[PDB]
């Protein structure tokens, strides 16, 4: 589990969006594995608007940062899950590294901010939501 808190906005990885975050829905996008609802406080995470390929994130499996390298935001064909059937999820972003189930929503963050959340894993891998280009985000 897992969420990035900034302005007014709530993002969560859609497969674990509550029933409040959709009666509050702002955009989501299945393909992403992304959702964002409204909130009445203000947040404090920063969002990061770069390039950055190397960064920390967060594994609850392992109680453990750890610093990565990871791909460019790409469409990646993603097996069969609990949540989705086989699919392609754009937007995504590959290190090597451990994810499990649970650890969907953990945080990576680069010297910028909040570049994105855990989203995918197994075989050594673990995959990242991109939320960089969600510049929206950042006004209103
Ligand atoms: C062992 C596979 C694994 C490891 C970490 S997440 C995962 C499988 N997964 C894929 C997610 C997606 N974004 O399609 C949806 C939820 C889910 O359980
Ligand atoms: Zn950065």
């Given at each position: 589990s897992g969420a990035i808190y900034v302005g007014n906005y709530r993002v969560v990885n859609r497969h674990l969006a509550t029933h409040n975050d959709w009666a509050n829905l702002v955009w989501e996008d299945s393909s992403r594995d992304l959702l964002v609802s409204s909130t009445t406080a203000q947040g404090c995470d920063t969002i990061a608007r770069c390039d950055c390929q190397t960064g920390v994130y967060y594994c609850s499996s392992r109680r453990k940062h750890y610093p990565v390298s990871f791909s460019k935001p790409s469409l990646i064909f993603v097996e069969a899950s609990e949540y989705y059937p086989a699919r392609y999820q754009s937007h995504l972003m590959l290190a090597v590294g451990h994810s499990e189930?649970?650890?969907?929503?953990g945080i990576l963050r680069c010297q910028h901010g909040v570049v994105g959340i855990v989203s995918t894993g197994g075989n050594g891998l673990v995959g990242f939501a991109d939320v960089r280009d969600l510049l929206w985000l950042d006004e209103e």
């Open positions: 189930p649970g650890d969907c929503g």
